[PDB]
C-alpha cells in the first residue's frame, strides 16, 4: 500500500510549524471564514434592517458595541444561504438581511468540530490520551445550546445572541428579565463549575509555585527546571500537609487532582447547556408557586425573589419595544411599570 | 438576594460595560478554560502504571519522587495543537500562569466593584451614534440601556421620592 | 423583607437581609438596640455576620 | 454451576464515599427548593 491517500496523509501530517491534519481541511477554512466573517461584519456591516441598530465601526460603533446581529425575526430559522431564496445571490442584500450571522454561527460550528477532531488526531499521533478533546466537548455543548438549539426553539435566529460584546451583555439581561435565568439550578451549576474551575486553577498554580524544591541558585526559580527531569518540581507532601492543616482536606493523589480539574468546569458548562436547552422552550425556572400563592394572598410577604420578579418585569416592559421591533410594541407612558419617583 | 444585588448593580453602574468586570470574566472563564486544559493534558499524559480493570489513579503513590505524567509528551501534543511556541515546556512557568491569570483577573473584577463603589461607571455609549439629521441610531449599547432602565425604575419601588438615584 | 426559612423561604430565596437604610454606615451591634426584637427588625445580623466574616 | 471468570471485585474508597455524599447532599440542597416549588 502506497497510493495517493497515504501520500496525502504523509503531507498533511508533516511536522511543521502549524500542524494541519485531515482535521485541518475542515477546521482551517471554517475557522478562518467564521473569524473573518465576524471581523468583516463588525468593521463594515449594519444591523439597520434587521434590528434598527448600528453595528459596525464604519457606522461609528466601537469595539464594545459592534456586532454581527441576528437576522430579522421574520427570517425565522432560515439558513439564509447567499444563494438561498431570501438574498438570491446578492451579497449586499445578504449582508443587509443578516446572512453574516448564520455564516458565522454555522462555520463557527463546523469549525469547532474541526478543532476537536484536530485534538483527537494530534493526540493519536503524539501518543497521548485524548482528554483534551473530551474536555473540549463542553465549549461545544455551550456553543450548540446557546447559538443553535436556543434560537431554534424560539421564534427565529433573531433571539440568538448577536456576535458582539454589547450584544452579548444584552443577551444576558434579556435572559434575566425573561427567563429569570439566575434562578435556574442548571445555571447555578454552570456558575459553580466556572468559579470552581477558576478557583482550582489559581489555588493549584499558587500551591505548586509555593512548594517548589530549590533546584537552582537563582532567586528567580523558573530556570531551575528541566523539561526532561524525572523528579517532581514541587513537594506534594508539603502541599498536602499545608492544606490538610489549613483547610481540613487536601489532595494526596496528583492524578485525581488533575482529573478533578478536568471534571469541574466541563461538568459546569455542560449543566448550563442543559439549562439553556430548557430555555429554548421557555421551560424556565421562573417562579416558586408557593411563593406566588403566599404573596398574592399576603401583601406584606416579601422576599428577594419577589423583588427580583419586579426587576424582571421592569426589564421586560422597558426593553421590549426597541429590542423586539417586529412586534410593533407601543407601550404608553402610563402602562410602564415604575416605582415611586424613578 | 445575590441576584438582586447583581441586577441592581447593572442598573446603577452598567458593570457589564465596565472593563474591569470584563477583565473579571476573562479571568474566571479563562481560569476555567486553563483549569480544564491543564487537567486534560496532564490526565492525557499519565504514565501507564495500571491495568484496565483498575483506576488510573492508583498509578500514582502519594509522595513519590518521580513525576506521574510526561510533560514532554504533553507539550508535544499542545505545541502541535496550536504551534510550538504557544506551549509551555516549563512546568514552573505554566503553573505560575495558572496562578496569575485568574488571580489578576479577579483582582480586576474586585477592583471593578470597588471603583464602581465610588460611581466611576461602565462605558456609556447611549446615543453615541447619530445620523446626518441628528436622529438617534441605536446600537446594542442602547438596548442594554433599555434593560438598565427597566431595572432602574422597578427596583425598590417605594424607596424613591425624588427623580434621580444619586446613590 | 422575609429572609428566613421559617418565615416562608426556601434555600434559593433565602438570605440574611442587609441592615436598614436608616442605619446607613452606623455601627449597629446588638447592644445599641433597645431589644433583640429591634435588632432583628433592623437587620443587625447582617452587620454582625459580615464584620466577623471579613475579620475571619 | 461452573463459576464465571469475568467476575471482578468492586471498590469505592473512603475519599470517594465522601466525595459522592458531598455531591448528592449539595445537589439535593440545590434542587430541593424546586422540588418543593
Amino acid at each position: 500500500e502506497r497510493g495517493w491517500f497515504d501520500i496525502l496523509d504523509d503531507w498533511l501530517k508533516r511536522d511543521r510549524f502549524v500542524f494541519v491534519g485531515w482535521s485541518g481541511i475542515l477546521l482551517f477554512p471554517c475557522a478562518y471564514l467564521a473569524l473573518g466573517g465576524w471581523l468583516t461584519g463588525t468593521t463594515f456591516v449594519t444591523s439597520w434592517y434587521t434590528h434598527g441598530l448600528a453595528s459596525s465601526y464604519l457606522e461609528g460603533c466601537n469595539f464594545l458595541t459592534v456586532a454581527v446581529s441576528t437576522p430579522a425575526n421574520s427570517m425565522g430559522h432560515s439558513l439564509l444561504l447567499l444563494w438561498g431564496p431570501e438574498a438570491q445571490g446578492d451579497f449586499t442584500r445578504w449582508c443587509q438581511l443578516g446572512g453574516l450571522w448564520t455564516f458565522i454561527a454555522l462555520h463557527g460550528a463546523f469549525g469547532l468540530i474541526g478543532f476537536m477532531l484536530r485534538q483527537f488526531e494530534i493526540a493519536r499521533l503524539v501518543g497521548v490520551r485524548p482528554y483534551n478533546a473530551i474536555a473540549f466537548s463542553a465549549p461545544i455543548a455551550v456553543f450548540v445550546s446557546v447559538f443553535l438549539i436556543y434560537p431554534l426553539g424560539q421564534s427565529s435566529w433573531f433571539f440568538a445572541p448577536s456576535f458582539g460584546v454589547a450584544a452579548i451583555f444584552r443577551f444576558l439581561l434579556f435572559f434575566q428579565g425573561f427567563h429569570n435565568w439566575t434562578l435556574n439550578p442548571f445555571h447555578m451549576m454552570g456558575v459553580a463549575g466556572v468559579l470552581g474551575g477558576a478557583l482550582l486553577c489559581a489555588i493549584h498554580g499558587a500551591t505548586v509555585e509555593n512548594t517548589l524544591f530549590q533546584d537552582g541558585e537563582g532567586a528567580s526559580t523558573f530556570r531551575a527546571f528541566n523539561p526532561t527531569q524525572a523528579e517532581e518540581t514541587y513537594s506534594m507532601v508539603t502541599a498536602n500537609r499545608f492544606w490538610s492543616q489549613i483547610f481540613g482536606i487536601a489532595f494526596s493523589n496528583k492524578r485525581w487532582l488533575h482529573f478533578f480539574m478536568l471534571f469541574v468546569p466541563v461538568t459546569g458548562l455542560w449543566m448550563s447547556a442543559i439549562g439553556v436547552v430548557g430555555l429554548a422552550l421557555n421551560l424556565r425556572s421562573y417562579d416558586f408557586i408557593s411563593q406566588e400563592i403566599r404573596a398574592a394572598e399576603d401583601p406584606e410577604f416579601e422576599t428577594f425573589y419577589t423583588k427580583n420578579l419586579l426587576l424582571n418585569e421592569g426589564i421586560r416592559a422597558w426593553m421590549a419595544p426597541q429590542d423586539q421591533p417586529h412586534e410593533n410594541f407601543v407601550f404608553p407612558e402610563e402602562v410602564l411599570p415604575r416605582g415611586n419617583a424613578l | 438576594g445575590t441576584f438582586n444585588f447583581m441586577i441592581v448593580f447593572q442598573a446603577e453602574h452598567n458593570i457589564l460595560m465596565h472593563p474591569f468586570h470584563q477583565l473579571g470574566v476573562a479571568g474566571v472563564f479563562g481560569g476555567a478554560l486553563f483549569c480544564a486544559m491543564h487537567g486534560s493534558l496532564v490526565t492525557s499524559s499519565l504514565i501507564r502504571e495500571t491495568t484496565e480493570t483498575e483506576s488510573a489513579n492508583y498509578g500514582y503513590k502519594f509522595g513519590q519522587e518521580e513525576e506521574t505524567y510526561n510533560i514532554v509528551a504533553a507539550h508535544g501534543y499542545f505545541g502541535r495543537l496550536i504551534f510550538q511556541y504557544a506551549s509551555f515546556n516549563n512546568s514552573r512557568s505554566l503553573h505560575f500562569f495558572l496562578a496569575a491569570w485568574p488571580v489578576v483577573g479577579v483582582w480586576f473584577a474586585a477592583l471593578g466593584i470597588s471603583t464602581m463603589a465610588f460611581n466611576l461607571n461602565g462605558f456609556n455609549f447611549n446615543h453615541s451614534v447619530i445620523d446626518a439629521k441628528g436622529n438617534v441610531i441605536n446600537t446594542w449599547a442602547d438596548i442594554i440601556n433599555r434593560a438598565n432602565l427597566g431595572m432602574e425604575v422597578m427596583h425598590e419601588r417605594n424607596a424613591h421620592n425624588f427623580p434621580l438615584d444619586l446613590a | 423583607v422575609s429572609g428566613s426559612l421559617l418565615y416562608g423561604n426556601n434555600i434559593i430565596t433565602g438570605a440574611v437581609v442587609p441592615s436598614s437604610n436608616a442605619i446607613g454606615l452606623h455601627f449597629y451591634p446588638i447592644w445599641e438596640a433597645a431589644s433583640l426584637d429591634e435588632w432583628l427588625y433592623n437587620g443587625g445580623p447582617y452587620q454582625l455576620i459580615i464584620f466577623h466574616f471579613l475579620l475571619g | 454451576m461452573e463459576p464465571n471468570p469475568n467476575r471482578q471485585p468492586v471498590e469505592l474508597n473512603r475519599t470517594s464515599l465522601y466525595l459522592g455524599l458531598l455531591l448528592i447532599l449539595v445537589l439535593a440542597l440545590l434542587f430541593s427548593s424546586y422540588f418543593f416549588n
Binding site: - | - | - | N13, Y18, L25, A28
Partner: peptide, 30 residues
C-alpha cells in the same frame, strides 16, 4: 416540612465535613 428538609440536608453536609476531615483515610508515603 420544607424547612425541616433544608436544615436536615445542611446538617448532613456539616457532619460530612466532620467525617471528611477528622476521619479521612490517612495519606501514606510509600
Amino acid at each position: 416540612m420544607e424547612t425541616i428538609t433544608y436544615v436536615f440536608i445542611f446538617a448532613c453536609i456539616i457532619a460530612l465535613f466532620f467525617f471528611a476531615i477528622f476521619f479521612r483515610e490517612p495519606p501514606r508515603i510509600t
